[PDB]
Design a protein around this ligand. Structure first.
Ligand SMILES: *[C@@H]1O[C@H](CO)[C@@H](O[C@@H]2O[C@H](CO)[C@@H](O)[C@H](O)[C@H]2NC(C)=O)[C@H](O)[C@H]1NC(C)=O
Ligand SMILES: C[C@@H](NCCc1nsc2ccccc12)c1cccc2c1OCO2
Ligand SMILES: C[C@@H](NCCc1nsc2ccccc12)c1cccc2c1OCO2
Ligand SMILES: N[C@@H](Cc1c[nH]c2ccccc12)C(=O)O
Ligand SMILES: N[C@@H](Cc1c[nH]c2ccccc12)C(=O)O
Ligand SMILES: *[C@@H]1O[C@H](CO)[C@@H](O)[C@H](O)[C@H]1NC(C)=O
Ligand SMILES: *[C@@H]1O[C@H](CO)[C@@H](O)[C@H](O)[C@H]1NC(C)=O
Ligand SMILES: *[C@@H]1O[C@H](CO)[C@@H](O)[C@H](O)[C@H]1NC(C)=O
Ligand SMILES: *[C@@H]1O[C@H](CO)[C@@H](O)[C@H](O)[C@H]1NC(C)=O
Ligand SMILES: *[C@@H]1O[C@H](CO)[C@@H](O)[C@H](O)[C@H]1NC(C)=O
Ligand SMILES: [Ca+2]
Ligand SMILES: [Ca+2]
Ligand SMILES: [Ca+2]
Ligand SMILES: [Ca+2]
Ligand SMILES: [Ca+2]
Ligand SMILES: [Ca+2]
Ligand SMILES: [Ca+2]
Ligand SMILES: [Ca+2]
Lengths: 772, 768
C-alpha cells in the first residue's frame, strides 16, 4: 500500500515520483529487545518540497494544455524518501505492485537501488539529480535515463581549474557513497595526468563517529596543503564542518562539487569565517513561467491531493493543527528556502523529465500504421500502452524545450550540459551568503579550450585578492638545482648550489650544465665567461721595457762599431786584431737581436730558435774573446770551430725533437697560459753546458794574467765580466725551476741583457774612453 | 512465484539460498520491438552446484541430528542467480512475499548488496559465504547482514606486505568494475603509498567490455615497463583480457591474484600457462566435512526429486538429453573430469556449511531458555512454535559456539568473522600437464602489525620454470661514487646517476646527495672516501734541510776554530796589530749570525717565526759595527741598541706566528708563517742595508793602503758581495711561492756570512 504520507491524484495514466522531503532518519538504533517499528525522519527540506511542487505543476500544466495529450488525463503518485534507501524501497514495491514511468531520486545510491528494482519490469526511470557514472552501464540499468550530466566532466573541470591557478599540492575529501568515490577516482586520474601531487584523501559520512571526525580534522591540520577538493553533499559534509569550526582552522581554499556548492546547510554566516571564498560548480538555470505563483498558492486546506502540506506549514510557522495556527498566515512572511531563490536548476530538470515522458506518450499516440517503431512497422495502442513501449519511444525521442533548446538522450540515456563557476561572498546588507558567478565551463569545445575564469571577480578566503600559494616547495632561482627529499613526492624538494665549472640559467633546473672547454663558471654560476689568456707579449709593461733596452743596447754597439771604423788608423786600435773585433761586435749585435725572440706569442718557430740563437751568439763572442789576446789566419779557425760545434749541437737537437707551443691550463683552472716547452732536456743541458765550460775556461785564463797592465788591464776586466755573467746566471736558478706564469719569460731577457751589457762594457768602455 | 527450476522441501522453518549455477546470461542487443521475454544464462558452474549440495547436506545432517532442534524439521527454498542482479531479485521477491526465516547469502558483492537492501526491510537475517566487500560492513545501511568470510582490508594489506617484502617498487594494477575490485584496489593504493611503492598504470575490466577497451588495456600493459601486476577480480570478469593477451603473446609478467580468481578454473588452463604461469595468490582456510564426497557422488536426475537442477547438471556432464544422444540414468559420475567432485580443499563449501549451522544454533538458543533469563525486555523468551525473523536476528547477533573441529565461532559488531590466509603458487603437473596450486606461505591476522607474513622462497617458481627473483624497479641503483638525479615529469621512483664533484664524496649506494668531509681532507679519484690533506714545509729530514744544517754547523765550527787559534796565539804581534778584544767579539757575533739561520728550518711554531728575523738583524748589525770600528765596545753597543729597540717593539706589537694556507691548492696545505706588520721587517731591512752602505763608503774611501795586509779593498769586496747577493734576491723572491721562499733565504744568509768571514780572517790565518 505504501507509506501513509503521500501526494496522489487520479488519472488515466499514473506517474511515480520520489523526493527527499526530509534530510535523514532518526539516530535511534534498535537493540531488538522488542518488535522493530517504523523509523521516523527528523529534519525538513524546503528545496525538496519545491522539487515536488515542480513535478506536480508540470503534470497539471500538461493536462491543461490541449496540444500534448488531448482527451487524456495524467495522474501522479509521489512519495518521500527521507534521503535513505530503506524508505525509497518501500515505495518502489508499491509502484511495481499501475505506473508507466517514475521520476527518479536524488542520491546515487537511492537511484541505484530503485533502478535495480525497476529494470526488472522495464519501467522507464528518469532521474533529475543522480550524476554517478556507474549509472551509464546499460547492461545493468536497462531503464535508467537522466536529465543531468555525469561527473566525468566535473572532475576534469576540477583538474583544469587546479592547473589554471598553478597549484601542485592539494588534498581531497569525498563522501563514502556512489557519488563521492567515482568522482574522486576520476579526479585522481586526471590530476596524475596533469602532474599534480595529492597529499591526503579521506572519507566522511552523515553518521560518522567522533573518533573518525577528530582523525580527519587532525589529518587536515597536520597537512601543509591549502587547497582541498570535496566531492560530497551537505548532509554528509555538515559534521566535519561543525568540528572544523569548533577547532577554528582557517586559511584553506575549498573546491566544491555541484551537490553542496549552493547548500544552505553549509553556507551559514557562523561558518563563513571558515568556508568563505568557496569556488564551486552549478548547472545551467532554466525558466518556468507561473511557477512562483503556483508555489505561493499552497495551503493545507485546499491542497486535498497533497499530503505533506500539513507538516510543511507546521515546520514553516512553528505551529500545530507550540501555539495553534488558524491557517491564515502568509508564506512570504517567513524566510525559508521554499520561495526564496534566484535560479532554478534541479526544478528545471524535474520539469524536463515530466515533459520527456509526456512527449514520448504523444509520439506513441501520433504514429500511423506502417510507420511504427515496432515489429512490421506496427503502432502501439494508446488505450493499452505499456511501460516497455514507452521506454522504447523514450530511447528514440528528441524534442524542443520552451526556450527552443533541443533535448536528445544518448545511447547511455545521458544528456550533455554546461557548468558555471561561482564564488561565495558575504552580503553587506544582512550578512547572508551570496553566490557570484566568476566563470563557466564549456563541454562542447575541445580539450584545453573548455574553461574561462575572471580572476578579478574572485575573492580568496572571503576577503582577499591575492592568489594563494600551495606548492610544498618555493622554487629556487638560477645557479641552483633541485635535490631529492627522501620519502616525499616529486613536488617537494630541496635546492643546492651548482659547483665550479658548471652553471644554471633557467629556474627550476634539475641539473647544472658544463660549459665547453674554453670557458669557466661565473661567481654565481649563472653564465660561463671566457677563459682568460695570459702570456708575456708586446704592448705590455715588461715587453716594451725589455725591447726598448734591446734597442738601446743595439744602438750602443752600433755606435761602438762606428767609432771603431772611423778610427781605423789610430795605433791604439792597431795591435788589437781588426779581424776579430768586428766579429765580436757583430756577435754582440746578434745576441742583442736574439734577446727579442723571448717576448711575444710563442709560435712554433719562435720557440725553435729563441734558445739556440743566444747559445750560438754567446759561444761566438766567447770564442772571439778567448783568442783576441796575442798570448796565444789561424785565430779565425778557433771562432769557426767553436761556433760550428755549437751549430752542430743545435741542429741535431732540432732534428731529433723540435720545441713547440703549448696551451697550459693545468696549474690553474681559471687562466690559461700559452707557454712553449723546450721539448728535450738533454740537448738543452748540452747547450747550456758547452757555454758554461767556455766561460770557465775564459775565466781561468784571464785569472792567470790579471797583474799585467798592458792593453789597458784587459784580463782584470775579462774576469769582471765573466764573474757578473756567472753570478747573474746562478741567481735565477730557483726561478727557472719554479716556472709558474709570465715572469719566467721576463727573467730570461733580463739575464740575456745583463750578460751582454757586462761583456760589451767590460771590453770596450776603457778603450772608447781613452780614445775620446 | 519465481523461476521454474529450483530446489524445495517442506518443514516448520524454511531456509532460503542463492547460488551461481550459471556463469552469466546470454547478453544480446534486445531492441524493444516486441514484449521482452526472460533471458537465459549459458555457462554451467559445477562449483556452484557443489556449494548448493553443501547447503542441502548441512540441512539434512541437522534434521538427522537428535541433539540439535529435536521434534522440528528444517526446509529449504533455493534459487539460481546466473551471477546477475536481475535473476537474484526475482528470487528474493518470493522470499519476502510459508515464510522465510533466514537466507544463505549470494556470491558476488554487488548481488549481495542488492539482495541485502531488500532483505533488511523485513529484518530477515542474511548470512553470506563469499562476499568480502568492506562496504557491506557498515550497519547503518545493512541491518541484517552477516558473513562467514573476512573482508578484503587484510588481503590488500597483505598484498602491500608481499610487494614490500620482495623489494619491488614499480607495479601496475588491474581491477574489476564492481563492488569487489574498486574498494580493494583503493585500500591497496593507500597501503602502497604508505609503504613507498609506485604504481605505473591502473585499468578496469569487465565481462561485458568491448573490443576497443580490451585492446586499449592490452596496449597499456605492453607500453608499460613494470612486470608485477596486482589484479582484484574474478574469473568471468578476467577471461576476455587473458584470452586477448594470450593471442598477442605477451610473456614475462608477474601476476598477484586475489582469492576470487587465484584458484579459478576458467583462467588456469594449459594453453594459457605460458602467460599466467607462476601466479602468486591467496586462498582461505580449508575445512573438513566428513560425509560430503559420498553425498556428492549420490546425485541422480530421478532419485533427486527435490533437486531441480539435477537434470541440467546431468545433461551438461554427460553431453546428452533427458544431435546430443539419448542417455541412461545409470552412468558413472567418477568417469568425467569436472570441478564437481575433483577438489583438494573445501573453503567456500565450508563457509556454506558454517552459515547453515550458525542459523541452526541461533534457533536452538531460541528453543532452550529459562524465563527471566532471556534476551528480550523483561528477561522473557520467544517460542519456537511462532519464532520470528527479528528474534532470530537478535540471537544471531548474540551467538557464540564451537564448530566440529573445536574452534569458537562468533560475529563481531559488524557481523564479520576473522580468518587466516594461505599463499599459493601456480605450477605445471609433471604427469597430467594441468595446473596444480602449491602452498608457499600464509598470512597471520592475530599477530601484531608487522609480523603477519611468512614466505618460503625456495618453493616458488617465478615465471613457471625460473628460480631467480625478478627485477621490477623503475631504474637501477646508484653506486658509492654517484648520487641520484631528478627526472622531470616522472615519479621519485626512477632517476639518473650523477657523479659528485671534487671536494665531495658519497658512501651509501642510494644516496640522494653526497656531502663533504671537513678541513684537511679532500675527495679521492673514485669519490668514495676522502684522503687527508698533505702538509708541506721545509723539513729537517728533507735533504735540503740536512744540507743547510751541515753548512751552518760547519760555519759554527770554523768560527770556533778561528777563535781558538786567536786565543792560543794571543802573543803574536799580528793579533795585537788589530784589536784582540774586538776580534773576539766579532768572532762571537759571527757565530751568532751563522747560528741564527737554524730558525728557518722545520715547521713554524709560535715563537720560531717571531724570532727568526730579529736574531739576524741584531747579529748582522753587531758584525758590521765591529768591522766599521775595526772605548769601542761603547760604539758597538750603541749600534746594536737601536736594532734591539726595533725588534723588541715589533715583537711586543705584532708577534709573528705560523699560518696555514688552505686557499692556494686543494690536497696540499702550507704553513708559511706570517711576517706580522711589514713596517718592522722593512725597517730591519733598511737599517741593515744603510749600515752596510756606510761601511762600503768608508771602506772605498781608503781602498788603497798596505797596512794591516791591505784589507780595506777586502772589506770593500765583502760589502760588494753582500749587497749584490741581497739585491739579486727580489726577482727570485717575488716570482716564487711554496717551499722555495724559505730555501733561498738560508742560501743568502750563508753566502753573506761566509763572505764576511773569508774576506777578513783568511789573510791573518794564512801567515800563522
Ligand atoms: C608552483 O608550482 C607550479 C607547478 O610546478 C609552478 O607553475 C609552473 O611554473 C613554471 C615556471 O614559470 C612554468 O614553466 C610551468 O608551466 C608552470 N606549471 C604549470 C602546470 O602551469 C608555479 O610557478 C609554482 N609556484 C611557485 C611560487 O613556486
Ligand atoms: C738564458 C739561458 N736560458 C736557460 C734557461 C734555463 N736555465 S736552467 C733552467 C731550468 C728550467 C727552465 C729553464 C732553465 C741560456 C740560453 C741559451 C744558452 C745558454 C743559456 O745560459 C747558458 O748558456
Ligand atoms: C735574513 C733577512 N730577514 C728576512 C728578510 C726578508 N724576508 S722576506 C724578504 C724579501 C725580500 C728581501 C728580504 C726579505 C734579513 C734580516 C735582517 C737584515 C737583513 C736581512 O736581509 C737583508 O738585510
Ligand atoms: N548529484 C548528487 C545529488 C544532488 C545534486 N544536487 C544536490 C543538491 C542537494 C542535495 C543533493 C544533490 C548525487 O548524485 O548524489
Ligand atoms: N569475494 C568475491 C566472491 C568470490 C569469492 N571466491 C570466489 C570464487 C569464485 C567466484 C567468486 C568468488 C566477491 O566478493 O565478489
Ligand atoms: C531530432 O529531431 C529532428 C527534428 O528537428 C529530427 O530530424 C532528427 O532526426 C532527430 N534526431 C537527431 C539525432 O537529430
Ligand atoms: C555552453 O557554453 C558555451 C560558452 O558560453 C556556449 O557557447 C554554448 O552555447 C553553451 N551551451 C549551452 C547548451 O548553453
Ligand atoms: C564463547 O564461549 C566460549 C566458551 O566458554 C567463551 O570462552 C567465549 O568467551 C565466548 N565468547 C564471547 C564473545 O564471550
Ligand atoms: C593463523 O596463522 C597463525 C600463524 O601460523 C596461527 O597461530 C593461527 O592459529 C592461525 N589461525 C587459525 C584460526 O588457525
Ligand atoms: C629496488 O628498489 C628498492 C626500493 O628502493 C630497493 O630496496 C631494492 O634494492 C631495489 N632492487 C634492485 C634489484 O635494485
Ligand atoms: Ca492535454
Ligand atoms: Ca530521494
Ligand atoms: Ca540543500
Ligand atoms: Ca612515503
Ligand atoms: Ca534435529
Ligand atoms: Ca551469486
Ligand atoms: Ca570457478
Ligand atoms: Ca606527467
Amino acid at each position: 500500500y505504501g507509506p501513509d504520507q503521500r501526494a496522489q491524484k487520479k488519472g488515466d495514466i499514473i506517474l511515480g515520483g520520489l523526493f527527499p522531503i526530509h534530510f535523514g532518519v532518526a539516530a535511534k538504533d534498535q537493540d531488538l529487545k522488542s518488535r522493530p517499528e517504523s523509523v521516523e525522519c527528523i529534519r525538513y527540506n524546503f528545496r525538496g518540497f519545491r522539487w515536488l511542487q515542480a513535478m506536480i505543476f508540470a503534470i497539471e500544466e500538461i493536462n491543461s494544455s490541449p496540444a500534448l495529450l488531448p482527451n487524456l488525463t495524467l495522474g501522479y503518485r509521489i512519495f518521500d524518501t527521507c534521503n535513505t534507501v530503506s524508505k525509497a524501497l518501500e515505495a518502489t514495491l508499491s509502484f511495481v505492485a499501475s505506473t508507466i514511468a517514475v521520476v527518479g531520486a536524488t542520491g546515487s545510491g537511492v537511484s541505484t537501488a530503485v533502478a535495480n528494482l525497476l529494470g526488472l519490469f522495464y519501467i522507464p526511470q528518469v532521474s533529475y539529480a543522480s550524476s554517478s557514472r556507474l549509472l551509464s552501464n546499460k547492461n545493468q540499468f536497462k531503464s535508467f535515463l537522466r536529465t543531468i550530466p555525469n561527473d566525468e566532466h566535473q572532475a576534469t573541470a576540477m583538474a583544469d581549474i587546479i592547473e589554471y591557478f598553478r597549484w601542485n599540492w592539494v588534498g581531497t575529501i569525498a563522501a563514502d557513497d556512489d557519488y563521492g568515490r567515482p568522482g574522486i577516482e576520476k579526479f585522481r586520474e586526471e590530476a596524475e595526468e596533469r602532474d599534480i601531487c595529492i597529499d591526503f584523501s579521506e572519507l566522511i559520512s552523515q553518521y560518522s563517529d567522533e573518533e573518525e571526525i577528530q582523525h580527519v580534522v587532525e589529518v587536515i591540520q597536520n597537512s601543509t596543503a591549502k587547497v582541498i577538493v570535496v566531492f560530497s553533499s551537505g548532509p554528509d559534509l555538515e559534521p566535519l564542518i561543525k568540528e572544523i569550526v569548533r577547532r577554528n582552522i582557517t586559511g584553506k581554499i575549498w573546491l566544491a562539487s555541484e551537490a553542496w556548492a549552493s547548500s544552505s546547510l553549509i553556507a551559514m554566516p557562523q561558518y563563513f569565517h571558515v568556508v568563505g571564498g568557496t569556488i564551486g560548480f552549478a548547472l545551467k538555470a532554466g525558466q518556468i513561467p507561473g511557477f512562483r505563483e503556483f508555489l505561493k498558492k499552497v495551503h493545507p486546506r485546499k491542497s486535498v491531493h497533497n499530503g505533506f502540506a500539513k507538516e510543511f506549514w507546521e515546520e514553516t510557522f512553528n505551529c500545530h493543527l507550540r501555539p495553534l495556527c488558524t491557517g491564515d498566515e502568509n508564506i512570504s512572511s517567513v524566510e525559508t528556502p521554499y520561495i526564496d531563490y534566484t535560479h532554478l536548476r534541479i526544478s528545471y530538470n524535474v520539469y524536463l523529465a515530466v515533459y520527456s515522458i509526456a512527449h514520448a506518450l504523444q509520439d506513441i499516440y501520433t504514429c500511423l500504421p506502417g510507420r511504427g517503431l515496432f515489429t512490421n512497422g506496427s503502432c502501439a495502442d494508446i488505450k493499452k500502452v505499456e511501460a516497455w513501449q514507452v521506454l522504447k519511444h523514450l530511447r528514440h525521442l528528441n524534442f524542443t524545450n520552451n526556450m527552443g533548446e533541443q533535448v536528445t538522450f544518448d545511447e547511455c540515456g545521458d544528456l550533455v550540459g554546461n557548468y558555471s563557476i561561482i564564488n561565495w561572498h558575504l552580503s553587506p546588507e544582512d550578512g547572508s551568503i551570496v553566490f557570484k558567478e566568476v566563470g563557466y565551463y564549456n563541454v562542447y569545445a575541445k580539450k584545453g579550450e573548455r574553461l574561462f575564469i575572471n580572476e578579478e571577480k574572485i575573492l580568496w578566503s572571503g576577503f582577499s585578492r591575492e592568489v594563494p600559494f600551495s606548492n610544498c616547495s618555493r622554487d629556487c632561482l638560477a645557479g641552483t638545482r633541485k635535490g631529492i627529499i627522501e620519502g616525499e613526492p616529486t613536488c617537494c624538494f630541496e635546492c643546492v648550489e651548482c659547483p665550479d665549472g658548471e652553471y644554471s640559467d633557467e629556474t627550476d633546473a634539475s641539473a647544472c650544465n658544463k660549459c665547453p672547454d674554453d670557458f669557466w663558471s661565473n661567481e654565481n654560476h649563472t653564465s660561463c665567461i671566457a677563459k682568460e689568456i695570459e702570456f708575456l707579449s708586446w704592448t705590455e709593461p715588461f715587453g716594451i721595457a725589455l725591447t726598448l733596452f734591446a734597442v738601446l743596447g743595439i744602438f750602443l754597439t752600433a755606435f761602438v762599431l762606428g767609432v771603431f771604423i772611423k778610427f781605423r788608423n789610430t795605433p791604439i786600435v792597431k795591435a788589437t786584431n781588426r779581424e776579430l773585433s768586428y766579429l765580436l761586435l757583430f756577435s754582440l749585435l746578434c745576441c742583442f737581436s736574439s734577446s727579442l725572440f723571448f717576448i711575444g706569442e710563442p709560435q712554433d718557430w719562435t720557440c725553435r730558435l729563441r734558445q739556440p740563437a743566444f747559445g750560438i751568439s754567446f759561444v761566438l763572442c766567447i770564442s772571439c774573446i778567448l783568442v783576441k789576446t796575442n798570448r796565444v789566419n789561424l785565430q779565425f779557425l778557433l771562432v769557426f770551430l767553436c761556433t760550428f760545434m755549437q751549430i752542430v749541437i743545435c741542429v741535431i737537437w732540432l732534428y731529433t725533437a723540435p720545441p713547440s707551443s703549448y696551451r697550459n691550463q693545468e696549474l690553474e683552472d681559471e687562466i690559461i697560459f700559452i707557454t712553449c716547452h723546450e721539448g728535450s732536456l738533454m740537448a738543452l743541458g748540452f747547450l747550456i753546458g758547452y757555454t758554461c765550460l767556455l766561460a770557465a775556461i775564459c775565466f781561468f785564463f784571464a785569472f792567470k794574467s790579471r797583474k799585467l797592465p798592458e792593453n789597458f788591464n784587459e784580463a782584470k776586466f775579462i774576469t769582471f765580466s765573466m764573474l757578473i755573467f756567472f753570478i747573474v746566471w746562478i741567481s735565477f736558478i730557483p726561478a727557472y725551476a719554479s716556472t709558474y706564469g709570465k715572469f719566467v719569460s721576463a727573467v730570461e731577457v733580463i739575464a740575456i741583457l745583463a750578460a751582454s751589457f757586462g761583456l760589451l762594457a767590460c771590453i770596450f768602455f776603457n778603450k772608447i774612453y781613452i780614445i775620446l
